[PDB]
Homo-oligomer: A and B are copies of this chain.
């Protein structure tokens, strides 16, 4: 209980292998993230994933400090992730954005800070800046300079570990090859589930001792207009539903356990007390090789989150094969 399952990252820190997702669609009020994160900690989640752009870090920070102050957990046993939004990729703005997140959290450091998405937009107060014709104002930024600035955040102790999200093979290579590289990314957080299992990019990341962290592992929030409402619903999949019945679990738990067995650190968002608790059952059963092969067979090239609002610049990550 005072113990939990973690993986060693390439900088020597440890990451719990089940993480709590905190993004909620625009219609959901704030008090909701506060209570959900408390419940998550209560249930046994020790890894909590957020971002500046989720507009919840005040509530998330409060939940974590509340659970430390009530004695449920110590700060050392919470692994909190934040992410740098694309209007702060300029290296002059990286540390201020991190300090801005720490101030909202009222925490002294994050355990992990990520580059949220590799397409940069113009700096300023708008998170999606637009021109007088409604066109997104993209910015030309060298992400190797952004990386340098993230490395100095780790040196300052403001982020214990640094990594990336939504990077493809070419963009990881660009960082791993950077002149004067000090710290590799510990992770690449990307969409990953049995309809899009990312085996090629997963193998690339394993070959470089980068951990792949899976978001939308339950099929995503399905929030319009980010996700099309006619994409297939992952947790309705017949093979997952059959395995869940066989195991007396649930399709979600099957989807979660698949990732754990393939060496993926898996996130799961739920703001529902029963499902938050149910998701921790991932550690209570195992899948056989034939079950794991049946789930591998489900891959169908369904990307829920294409984020094509950001397509056009060379750093848009999803037009490459991987």
| Contact flag A284-B203 (CB < 8 Å), given A3-B14, A261-B263, A263-B261 | no
B285 touches A209 (CB 8 A): yes
- How many of A's residues come within 8 Å of B, CB to CB? 26
Question: Which of chain B's residues has its CB closest to A246's CB?
Answer: B207
Q: Does A230 contact B (CB under 8 A)?
A: no
Q: Which of B199, B202, B289 contacts A202, CB < 8 Å?
A: B289
Bound complex: CA A6 to CA B46 (Å): 15
Q: Which residues of B contact A130 (CB under 8 A)?
A: none
Mark out the residues of chain A between 34 and 57 whose CB falls within 8 Å of any chain B CB in the assembled complex.
none
| Contact flag A289-B14 (CB < 8 Å), given A3-B6, A8-B283 | no
Bound complex: CA A316 to CA B262 (Å): 34
B287 touches A206 (CB 8 A): yes
B8 touches A5 (CB 8 A): yes
Using an 8 Å CB-CB cutoff, how does the interface string of A1-26 with B read, 1 for contact, 0 for none? 10111111010101000000000000
Q: Which residues of B contact A207 (CB under 8 A)?
A: 286, 288
Q: Does A290 contact B (CB under 8 A)?
A: yes
A290 touches B5 (CB 8 A): no
Q: Which residues of B contact A263 (CB under 8 A)?
A: 261, 286
A7 touches B6 (CB 8 A): no
A5 touches B3 (CB 8 A): no
B289 touches A199 (CB 8 A): yes
Most B CB within 10 A of own CB, among A209, A283, A286: A286
Q: Which residues of B contact A284 (CB under 8 A)?
A: 8, 10, 209
Q: Which residues of B contact A285 (CB under 8 A)?
A: 209
Mark out the residues of chain A between 89 and 140 whose CB falls within 8 Å of any chain B CB in the assembled complex.
none
B203 touches A288 (CB 8 A): yes
Using an 8 Å CB-CB cutoff, how does the interface string of A274-297 with B read, 1 for contact, 0 for none? 000000000111111110000000
A1 CB to closest chain B CB, in angstroms? 8
Question: Which of chain B's residues has its CB closest to A17's CB?
Answer: B5
Most B CB within 10 A of own CB, among A3, A206, A261, A288: A3
B8 touches A6 (CB 8 A): no
Bound complex: CA A3 to CA B2 (Å): 11
Question: Which of chain B's residues has its CB closest to A7's CB?
Answer: B5
Bound complex: CA A81 to CA B308 (Å): 54
Bound complex: CA A290 to CA B206 (Å): 11
Bound complex: CA A290 to CA B207 (Å): 10
Bound complex: CA A42 to CA B4 (Å): 22
Q: Which residues of B contact A199 (CB under 8 A)?
A: 289
The list of the 3 closest CB pairs from A to B, nearest first, reads: A206-B286, A203-B288, A3-B14
Besides A5-B8, A207-B286, 5 new A-B residue pairs in contact (Cβ under 8 A), listed by A number: A3-B14, A4-B6, A5-B5, A5-B14, A203-B289
A-B contact pairs, 15 of them (CB 8 A): A3-B14, A5-B8, A8-B284, A10-B284, A199-B289, A203-B289, A203-B290, A206-B286, A206-B288, A206-B289, A207-B286, A207-B288, A209-B285, A209-B286, A263-B286
